[PDB]
Every structure is written in C-alpha cells, then in structure tokens.
Scaffold this active site. Structure first.
Site, PDB file in Angstrom:
ATOM      1  N   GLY A   1       0.775  -1.343   0.132  1.00  0.00           N
ATOM      2  CA  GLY A   1       0.100  -0.049  -0.057  1.00  0.00           C
ATOM      3  C   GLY A   1       0.961   1.263   0.110  1.00  0.00           C
ATOM      4  O   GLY A   1       0.261   2.354  -0.332  1.00  0.00           O
ATOM      5  N   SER A   2       2.218   1.120   0.414  1.00  0.00           N
ATOM      6  CA  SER A   2       3.007   2.493   0.516  1.00  0.00           C
ATOM      7  C   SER A   2       3.244   2.830  -0.881  1.00  0.00           C
ATOM      8  O   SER A   2       3.707   2.229  -1.510  1.00  0.00           O
ATOM      9  CB  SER A   2       4.260   1.919   1.283  1.00  0.00           C
ATOM     10  OG  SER A   2       5.410   2.842   0.849  1.00  0.00           O
ATOM     11  N   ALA A   3       2.887   4.116  -1.061  1.00  0.00           N
ATOM     12  CA  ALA A   3       3.430   4.810  -2.431  1.00  0.00           C
ATOM     13  C   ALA A   3       4.882   4.894  -2.599  1.00  0.00           C
ATOM     14  O   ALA A   3       5.385   4.537  -3.810  1.00  0.00           O
ATOM     15  CB  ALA A   3       2.639   6.413  -2.413  1.00  0.00           C
TER      16      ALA A   3
ATOM     17  N   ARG B   1       5.877   1.370  -4.143  1.00  0.00           N
ATOM     18  CA  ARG B   1       5.427   1.229  -5.253  1.00  0.00           C
ATOM     19  C   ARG B   1       6.139   2.062  -6.249  1.00  0.00           C
ATOM     20  O   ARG B   1       6.196   1.317  -7.433  1.00  0.00           O
ATOM     21  CB  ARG B   1       4.048   1.505  -5.498  1.00  0.00           C
ATOM     22  CG  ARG B   1       3.156   0.794  -4.693  1.00  0.00           C
ATOM     23  CD  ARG B   1       1.468   1.194  -4.766  1.00  0.00           C
ATOM     24  NE  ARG B   1       1.151   1.994  -3.808  1.00  0.00           N
ATOM     25  CZ  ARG B   1       0.637   3.319  -4.076  1.00  0.00           C
ATOM     26  NH1 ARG B   1       0.375   3.805  -5.150  1.00  0.00           N
ATOM     27  NH2 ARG B   1       0.064   3.990  -3.091  1.00  0.00           N
TER      28      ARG B   1
END
Lengths: 212, 212
Positions: free
Chosen positions: A8-10, A13
């Site tokens: 979930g961490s941008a 990603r």
C-alpha cells in the site's frame, strides 16, 4: 537485492515501478507491520528510521525510496533514459523528486492522514495546499510529455505512485488537464504498471474503505 | 550562474556552503520578500512555486536546494568527493538528503513555525518527533566522521544548514553526542562556513529574538 516493503505504501510502489522499468528482479520481503517487524533489532540495523522501503543490495542498506530509485539506475541502468547523466537533465529529474517528497506527497499526507488515523474532519485549507501542489505539477507538465522532459524518468514513477494514492482519498486531481494527460500516459507507458503500482494501490484502497 | 536567495533560509545557506566548498562564483540576487518580489510574473517564469533558492544557470532554472547542490557538483565539481560518482557512496549521500527534507527539517518546521508564526504554545509531541529525528541523525553518525562517510559531502552541508536553524529555536541538539561532534567538525572544516552559513543564520536569529 532485497526490498523490504508493504504494497500500500506509495514510496514502495515507486521502487517496484523503477525495478520493472529496469527489467530488474528484486527479492521482495513483505514487512509484518501487524507484528511491528520493522522495529525489531535486525531491521533497525538495516534502517534506523524503521520505515519501508529498504533496499539491501550486497550488504548495503538504503532507506528513502527516492534514493533507492536513483541508485537502481546509477548501478543497474546502462542504456536507460530513466535518470540521464547530463547535469542539466538530471537536475530537472532531481528537482521533481524533491518536489514530490517535500511538497506534493507531504501536503497529501498532512491532508489525508488526520482524517484516516485521527478521525478529524476535512480541513479545507489543507485540501487547498494539495490543490496548489497539483497546480504546480500541472504547470510543470505544460507542453511536455513527462514531468522532466520527453522521456519517462524516475521522477514520473515516484510522482505517479504519489498521485495514484490521491484516488483512495477521492481527491479530484483529474480536473488538472496536464496532470490528467500525464497520468494516463504513465499508466500506459510505465512497464508493469498494474502489477507494480495498481495492485498495491488496491490494498491501500481496501484499508481506506474499511475505515471510512 | 545566478542564485536567487535570502540569507535566513537554511536551503539557501546550503547552496552558499556548496558554492564555497566548490570554490565557485555565483551571482547572488537577493529576493525582496518584504515587497513580495517572488510573486512577480518574471520570477514565477523561473520558479512557479515562488520559493528560494532558485539557481538560474545558462537558461535552466532549478528550484529545490538539494537538487541545486548536486547539480553544482555534477556540473562544476566533476570528480569531487562532495558528491562521489560511485553508486553506493552516492546513494548514502542521496539518502541523507531525503532524510533532511522529509524528516529532520520537516519536523523542525512542524514544531517551530506554529510557535513563531502562529503564536501557538509549544507542542511537546512535536518536540518529541524533532528529538527522534536527531536520534536518527546521531545513529547515522555513530561510527563515521560525517553523515554519509568519512569525507565532507553535500549532505553534510545541507544538514548543517538545517541543524543551524535549531539554535534560533533554542532546541537542544548538542545533547546528542555524535551530532555535537559532527556539528563542530562541519563548522571547522566546511570552507567559508561563517560567511556562507553563520552570517545568514544571524538574520533568522534576529527575527526570533525580536518576537520571542
């Protein structure tokens, strides 16, 4: 190399997008945040800030996603336009990366995380700072294909990971016309976009929908 | 090249330290914030974010001090140890620069600017986040002379300008023993420290003393 991450961490990603664009396989290590794995002593030897991502590559541990992005091209990116060596062109990529961490994603986090974690109502002044950062990004894209030139760079991959996260907060960013054109361009041209960014974005959305 | 600057700004003093360490002349252009010069159309042509510093170098305008710092070494200090070309050593410098903007200086501003500009009382939870960032910096220096190795780098110059500002807020950072050793080392070994950083720091201190 190992990548300690959560999907979930941008910032995580952004690393996954960069590795796909470099055709570089990373040994992914999912970090158990539900048991506080990042604050156990062996993780803190790698990363004293106990954050994700952490890249470990032959003994060297790198925190700060945007330092990981440029390291991967500096070390593994022969024949890449993702981080050009010309000092003028590199300075434009470097400038957009500092804009990403210091202005755009910082204002997004200051706006959204009091609503998600603190239960606070929507601050329209903090939303206005997000809209101002989006207008700066819209101005950077005026007449250009990507944020730092005509080639996809690590600045685009860092910024698309940040800007995709705005969807989970239902922030209107597509009303900025250059941002909208650039967003759809990166989604169509970043290698492995749906796997590296789109899948982890859905985990962030599932967290947000379960709370709000 | 031109440098649009203000002396109280820690990001501007980081550029001034880097130019001194590179033995580089920049044409300094003081920005009149007391008449809002940064919001004229010509300045916003150079820098849409209307911030300082802005470096203008032969048609290219660069905002984001930490992107300016690396540009100056990449363009005018090729082969200098202030920003080494080896990808591992460069990654440690880049990691400390993103720590500077995203964690250490960000938390300092979140702590101090509500007291200075907003008149709010001292938030000790925000002081605790500043102290945690100083403990991270203390841990980074635990076993090295400087923040990214045993040589002076641009990360040291960026971070000493950030940590210099803590004096005006009367934040106790010298109780962190590695930070104290490193801070005094940078003051004694960075070329032209008092001219590039100490002099402009006094203008920030004079503002704080007049209010608090």
């Amino acid at each position: 190399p190992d990548l300690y991450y959560v999907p979930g961490s941008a910032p995580c990603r952004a690393v996954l997008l960069t590795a796909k664009a470099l055709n570089l396989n990373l040994n992914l290590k999912l970090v158990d945040l539900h048991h506080g794995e990042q604050m156990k002593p062996e993780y803190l030897k790698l990363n004293p800030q106990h954050t994700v991502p952490t890249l470990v590559d032959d003994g060297l541990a790198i925190a700060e996603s945007r330092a990981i992005l440029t390291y991967l091209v500096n070390k593994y990116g022969k024949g890449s336009t993702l981080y050009p060596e010309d000092p003028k062109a590199r300075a434009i990529v470097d400038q957009r990366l500092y804009f990403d961490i210091g202005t755009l994603y910082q204002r997004f986090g200051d706006y959204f995380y009091p609503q998600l974690f603190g239960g606070a109502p929507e601050d329209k002044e903090k939303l206005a700072k997000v809209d101002e950062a989006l207008k700066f990004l819209d101005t950077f894209l005026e007449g250009q294909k990507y944020v730092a030139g005509n080639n996809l760079t690590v600045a685009d991959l860092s910024l698309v990971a940040s800007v995709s996260s705005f969807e989970a907060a239902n922030i209107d960013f597509l009303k900025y016309g250059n941002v909208k054109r650039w967003y759809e361009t990166v989604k169509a041209t970043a290698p492995g976009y749906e796997e590296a960014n789109g899948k982890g974005l859905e985990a962030f959305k599932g967290l947000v929908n379960s709370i709000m």
